[PDB]
């Protein structure tokens, strides 16, 4: 689809079996959700945005969909003020910035 | 044009006569630039991400060329670690996400 930006971006993703609300966000490198339980394997890490550095859990080749497009990637776990999909998975589902 | 998200979507801009590099960031609401002495008044306001909040002052209607394509509206200015072009800039150029 086309999306304007007169609002904010906002999705539905699945996640582990759950669905949620994402905000589409080319400024991050990274996608972060906030807190909530995946299964597998995952490592800690930290990661930095506008206001400094949290901690988060890294999940590897993490299945999501979003918006209806599948992705296989990493997911960061972690206090984000909102849940963001970032460059990594933006690429996987084809998504481009068009003006 | 189109701007995929293999890397990081940065752009040259120019505001109040000056050159710079910016982020077409999805995710942020407003622009906000690393600090710089704009002429003026200005408004106190705290924006938040990851990390925490920032400190800026709010610049209102100000005029910035981004690609080429001119618009005019709050710039935000502060220590932020990188220039970003927000939404209520984003759309006076005419600039969606398509997937
Ligand atoms: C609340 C929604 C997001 C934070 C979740 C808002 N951000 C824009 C975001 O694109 C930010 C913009 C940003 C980019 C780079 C450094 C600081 C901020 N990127 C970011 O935080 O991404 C992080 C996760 O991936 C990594 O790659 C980038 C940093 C990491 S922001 O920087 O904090 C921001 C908030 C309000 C305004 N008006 C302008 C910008």
Redesign the interface.
Known sequence: ??????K??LVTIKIGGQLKEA???????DT?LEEMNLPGRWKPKM????????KVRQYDQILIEI?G?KAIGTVLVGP??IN?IG?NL??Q???????
């Open positions: 689809p086309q999306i304007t930006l007169w904010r971006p905000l589409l966000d080319t400024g991050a490198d972060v990661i930095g945005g506008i206001g400094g550095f949290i918006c497009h984000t003020p963001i460059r933006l690429t589902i084809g998504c481009t910035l068009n003006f």
